[PDB]
Amino acid sequence: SMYTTAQLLAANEQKFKFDPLFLRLFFRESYPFTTEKVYLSQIPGLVN
Amino acid sequence: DPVEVDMGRSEENNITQSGGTEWSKRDKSTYDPTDDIEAYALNASGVV
């Protein structure tokens, strides 16, 4: 149908800057849990 | 014959200073242009 010719030189996949700093520094460990709620506790610790 | 060749450069890449922020109206002291050049380079697609 068409007698044109074309050659492809180079293609790029542009990408947006992204680096998980806050996970990598502070939230270091994972805790998978199979239950339905998670409890986090504290203790006062003030002794006269 | 006049032929137009162009690539896709977003309008934010070609920056022209107008109004304030002229780099020649602010006083030559108490101002570091490092902030301006870092802000400009924030538009880049890779390390400069």
From Swiss-Prot, chain B:
It is found in: Virion; Host cytoplasm. Disulfide bonds: none annotated. Homomultimer. Interacts with FI protein. Assembles to form an icosahedral capsid with a T=7 symmetry. The icosahedral capsid is about 60 nm in diameter and composed of 415 major capsid proteins. The assembly is primed by the interaction between capsid assembly protease and portal dodecamer, and major capsid proteins assemble cooperatively to form the procapsid with the help of capsid scaffolding protein. Major capsid protein forms hexons and pentons of the icosahedron. Viral genomic DNA is packaged into the procapsid through the portal vertex. Belongs to the lambda phage major capsid protein family. This is Major capsid protein. It comes from Escherichia phage lambda (Bacteriophage lambda). The gene is E. The chain holds residues 148 to 195 of 341 of the full protein.
